[PDB]
Write a protein that binds this ligand. Structure first.
Ligand code: HEC
Ligand code: HEC
Ligand code: HEC
Ligand code: HEC
Ligand code: NA
Ligand code: NA
Lengths: 106, 101, 106, 106
């Protein structure tokens, strides 16, 4: 799907996690955030249409998602142990990874 | 060392990076920031296995990751790009300050 | 491609890096390993074919590749800066990631 | 602390995890390993005293601790979820990273 649709699925499910009641709701939100981030992996962003797939910048771009996928998995792991407090706070801490890619490429 | 001392090192060296002219200065400072962060990991700010303390420790884990990626750039001589990465660290410094400072 | 084929590629290109005499061999080999690790990420290994796609084991197994893809990219980045020796060394260090996965799921 | 000391901390605490019976022991042992690895990251080993701090050998030396820290972090993740057996098995798999650094630099 589109990068915007993935960025919407990321932004939406983050607020789902913030306002959730339990680990199942958190989990399925993280599972959807994960699938969306791995789907936006291939996208060329508007601000780098003048760079090739194997350029330094597109490696750095794709690496920003590698970081995000990893953190989602750490959070998701916390949800699967029934640690909802901690998972919710881990999800919160993604914000600076989201932010860091935007400060460079959004 | 003490928690104030780790924060000082982190703050001091973030400035050294801001005003640096070369990759060696920037490496040196990132390296010292990595050490202070891989140190401050195991302190308590004003239960150890509480949800708060995990998340306190987790903040330093995330910060260590970003310092290490900045080091990647500085080790590759990409000095400007390392300095921007270093500027973006503030988000994590701040986000933890908002919480538990 | 098949999981076995991804694994030959990984093993073959790892020995190419070991024996390389120039920067292009290491870079090219690291590029082919990155692609093969990415492709293999979604595969289901024989020993977990009767597990759910959302089992803890399939998350662990998927994560093992997340680790590997990360080290491959670290090494590739080093090679792209002319730190080819460091990249060859990094490639050798992959072996414990290869072994960690095999131990559990091969 | 001294490098030998950090190694002594790594070795003793690994043995503690192997023969543990609860999560608290495992978490605490891994925490001493992390701190030992952190502190050891900055050291210069006897065999690389005759090299530049920016040498491939020293870069690769530091990297071995980076890999090890990452594996300790994961083991710590399993231990926090009371997945004691799995954390003990992840701890065992650290020995590959130990051995790989020793074979080169010890
Ligand atoms: C790259 C490494 C990114 C990561 C990781 C995240 N985002 Fe993103 N985002 C990125 C780009 C390049 C863009 C621009 C999209 C475009 O087509 O111009 C975005 C955009 C967004 C948006 C706005 C989408 C829109 O329709 O205007 C949002 C709301 C957004 N991003 C949210 C978001 C969140 C919540 C993330 C992590 C939790 C995240 N992004 C990560 C690049 C990258
Ligand atoms: C937790 C996850 C933290 C991260 C990451 C960073 N900081 Fe920190 N910082 C933290 C706490 C709990 C406190 C309060 C400590 C106290 O006893 O007052 C601080 C404080 C500081 C300070 C002020 C220290 C003082 O003597 O008053 C500074 C200057 C500071 N922190 C800087 C800093 C920088 C530069 C960081 C990242 C680059 C950073 N901190 C991260 C907790 C955490
Ligand atoms: C999971 C997280 C894996 C990682 C990372 C690596 N390997 Fe792998 N490998 C894995 C599985 C499940 C299997 C069994 C495949 C099967 O269908 O039986 C393998 C197999 C191999 C093989 C042998 C293939 C065969 O003919 O039986 C080799 C040579 C191999 N793997 C090499 C290899 C290398 C070099 C890796 C990292 C550098 C590596 N593997 C990582 C699972 C995983
Ligand atoms: C480098 C990247 C290392 C990693 C990772 C590990 N070890 Fe280590 N170890 C390393 C060096 C260079 C040395 C030699 C130190 C010296 O002064 O000679 C060692 C030594 C040890 C020792 C011997 C202690 C002594 O008194 O000399 C032990 C017991 C030891 N190392 C244990 C150990 C363990 C358990 C690790 C993982 C579990 C490990 N090491 C990783 C370098 C590195
Ligand atoms: Na003071
Ligand atoms: Na089946």
């Amino acid at each position: 799907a589109d990068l915007e649709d993935n960025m919407e699925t990321l932004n939406d499910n983050l607020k789902v996690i913030e306002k959730a009641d339990n680990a199942a709701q958190v989990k399925d939100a993280l599972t959807k955030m994960a699938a969306a981030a791995c789907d936006a992996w291939s996208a060329t962003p508007p601000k780098l249409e003048d760079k090739s797939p194997d350029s330094p910048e597109m490696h750095d771009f794709r690496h920003g998602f590698w970081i995000l996928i990893g953190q989602i998995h750490d959070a998701l792991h916390l949800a699967n142990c029934g640690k909802v407090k901690e998972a919710q706070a881990a999800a919160e801490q993604l914000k600076c990874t989201c932010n860091a890619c935007h400060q460079k490429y959004r």
